[PDB]
Amino acid sequence: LKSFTVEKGIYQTSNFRVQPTESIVRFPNITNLCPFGEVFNATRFASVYAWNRKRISNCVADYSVLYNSASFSTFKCYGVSPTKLNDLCFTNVYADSFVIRGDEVRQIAPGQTGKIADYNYKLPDDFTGCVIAWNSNNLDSKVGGNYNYLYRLFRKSNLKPFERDISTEIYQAGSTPCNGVEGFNCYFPLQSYGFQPTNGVGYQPYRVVVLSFELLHAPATVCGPKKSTNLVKNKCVNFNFNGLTGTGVLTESNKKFLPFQQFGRDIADTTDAVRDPQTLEILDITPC
Amino acid sequence: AYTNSFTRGVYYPDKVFRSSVLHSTQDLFLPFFSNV
Amino acid sequence: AGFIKQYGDCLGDIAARDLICAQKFNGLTVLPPLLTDEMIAQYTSALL
Amino acid sequence: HTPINLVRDLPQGFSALEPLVDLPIGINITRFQTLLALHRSYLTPGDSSSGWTAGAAAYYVGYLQPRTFLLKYNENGTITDAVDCALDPLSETKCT
Numbered sequence: 001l002k003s004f005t006v007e008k009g010i011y012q013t014s015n016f017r018v019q020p021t022e023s024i025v026r027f028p029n030i031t032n033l034c035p036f037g038e039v040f041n042a043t044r045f046a047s048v049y050a051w052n053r054k055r056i057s058n059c060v061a062d063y064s065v066l067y068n069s070a071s072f073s074t075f076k077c078y079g080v081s082p083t084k085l086n087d088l089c090f091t092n093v094y095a096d097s098f099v100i101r102g103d104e105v106r107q108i109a110p111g112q113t114g115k116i117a118d119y120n121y122k123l124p125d126d127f128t129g130c131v132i133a134w135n136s137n138n139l140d141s142k143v144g145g146n147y148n149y150l151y152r153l154f155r156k157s158n159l160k161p162f163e164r165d166i167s168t169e170i171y172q173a174g175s176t177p178c179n180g181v182e183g184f185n186c187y188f189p190l191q192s193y194g195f196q197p198t199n200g201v202g203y204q205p206y207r208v209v210v211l212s213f214e215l216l217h218a219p220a221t222v223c224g225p226k227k228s229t230n231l232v233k234n235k236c237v238n239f240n241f242n243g244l245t246g247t248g249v250l251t252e253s254n255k256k257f258l259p260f261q262q263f264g265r266d267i268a269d270t271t272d273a274v275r276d277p278q279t280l281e282i283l284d285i286t287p288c
Numbered sequence: 289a290y291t292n293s294f295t296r297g298v299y300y301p302d303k304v305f306r307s308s309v310l311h312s313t314q315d316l317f318l319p320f321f322s323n324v
Numbered sequence: 325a326g327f328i329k330q331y332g333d334c335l336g337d338i339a340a341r342d343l344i345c346a347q348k349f350n351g352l353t354v355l356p357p358l359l360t361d362e363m364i365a366q367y368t369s370a371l372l
Numbered sequence: 373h374t375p376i377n378l379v380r381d382l383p384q385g386f387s388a389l390e391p392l393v394d395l396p397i398g399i400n401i402t403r404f405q406t407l408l409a410l411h412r413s414y415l416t417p418g419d420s421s422s423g424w425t426a427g428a429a430a431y432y433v434g435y436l437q438p439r440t441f442l443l444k445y446n447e448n449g450t451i452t453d454a455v456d457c458a459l460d461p462l463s464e465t466k467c468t
Contacts, residue, residue: 057396058396216398218396218398219396219398221396233332233335234331234332235332236331237335239335241336246349248331248334248335248336248339248349249331249332249334249335250332250335250336251330251331251332251333251334251335253333253336253338253339255307255338256448256449257305257449258305258390258449258450260300260303260390260391261303261304261305261449262303262304262305262337263303263304263305263336263337264304264305264306264307264336264337264338264339264340264341265304265305265306265309265337265340266339266340266341266342266343266346267306267308267309267340267341267343268340268343268346268347269340270340270346270349270350271336271337271340272336272337272338272339272340272341272342272345272346273336273337273338273339273341274336274337274338275336275337282336282338283335283336284333284334284335284336284338284339285334285335285336285337285338285339285340285345285346285349286329286330286331286332286333286334286335286339286345286348287334287345287348287349287350288331291381291382291432292381293382293432293434294382294384295384295385295386295454296382296385296386296387297389297434297436298386298387298388298389298441298443298451298454299388299389299390299391300388300389300390300391300443300451301443303391304337305337305338305449306445306449307338307341307445307446307447307448307449308341308445308446308447309445310442310443310444310445311442311443311445312440312441312442312443312467313440313441313443314438314439314440314441315438315439315441316436316437316438316439317436317437317439317441317456318434318435318436318437319434319437319439319456319458319459320454320456320459321456321459322434323434324382324432324433324434
């Protein structure tokens with residue numbers, strides 16, 4: 001009233017509002033996880049020059065295990081926060097796994113040059129993705145030496161990003177026709193790495209997996225995991241179902257939703273009763 | 289040969305559930321009484 | 325009518341089937357009339 | 373899917389089409405073509421000469437057009453009827 005004296009009557013002083021008790025964050029059921037195990041806990045590894053590329057899509061990719069796990073020597077993500085992967089979603093994810101020398105591990109990063117970066121495995125300057133690597137002295141190394149891994153010495157031109165060249169053909173450095181065989185000025189294009197368990201840290205073979213996350217307008221297939229909480233009913237709560245958010249008291253409804261349909265709607269165009277992503281229950285909408 | 293697709297070609301525009309309501313929307317649909 | 329709506333009964337995407345509840349959601353409130361219907365009838369009875 | 377004792381022409385009646393699948397292909401498709409199957413019985417010799425039967429079936433194709441429609445939702449949430457407000461003056465009023 002802006003006055004010291006108040007005349008008799010009824011006056012509207014303020015507004016009554018129930019505050020929310022707790023915050024609920026939810027994402028859908030965990031199932032249909034991307035096969036990370038196939039990549040990281042893989043029995044065999046590809047060579048640097050021709051690396052294995054497994055596309056990961058149509059799943060809920062749980063990054064947390066890779067970030068948290070001790071087993072990897074390093075885990076670096078350029079484009080996005082490594083913590084963010086659980087929340088972030090990408091249209092397509094490619095995993096490039098290859099075995100390379102320890103000293104060279106640094107080369108797997110955007111804006112780098114070297115034997116791998118130029119000829120072997122090149123990364124985009126803009127590259128968005130994370131590089132995870134660990135040692136495999138125990139697995140890969142051989143006393144005799146593990147020759148199986150090759151990298152490339154010669155090429156017509158520098159390699160573009162993510163371009164891989166498997167080709168076996170003899171590279172003709174000079175004028176003389178190689179005719180498929182080595183000779184003067186003719187060499188097999190790739191050289192092997194001699195990894196042996198005895199060697200030093202830099203020398204040790206390392207398994208590196210890079211998860212590129214191509215981002216396009218196209219529907220995003222690979223999204224992060226679901227950090228969800230328990231459902232509480234009959235209480236004003238701050239709820240966050242898959243797409244939407246709001247505050248109200250979730251109660252059991254007597255509504256029969258179609259198997260495909262997720263959310264109801266008001267005549268008015270409001271959010272009324274929602275289907276819980278975890279449990280196929282229909283819970284009706286009530287402002288607190 | 290052409291026939292009349294009188295009523296057919298209607299599919300749910302979205303996943304959203306609605307009830308006892310008339311919801312107008314514009315989507316790609318087979319026209320009524322269109323020529324097929 | 326009744327001026328009482330079960331809070332819980334209400335919370336998700338269906339309750340807005342109940343339009344008033346939805347209105348309850350966005351600050352839209354309906355104040356009741358001072359003279360109740362029963363009260364109104366009495367006048368109508370008296371005036372009559 | 374519905375059972376029908378239909379005329380060659382499509383039955384006149386209204387039904388909805390529920391969504392089975394959503395594929396993330398993200399490929400630009402200009403055109404399409406339908407595939408049919410052949411049906412050979414024991415009597416036929418296997419060869420491609422003339423031992424094959426296509427069968428009775430027929431199909432129809434129409435094309436979608438951006439239009440406005442009024443969808444009537446049942447208590448169930450199934451759609452009973454629809455109005456093509458583009459179609460007729462009576463229809464145009466219905467949307468309004």
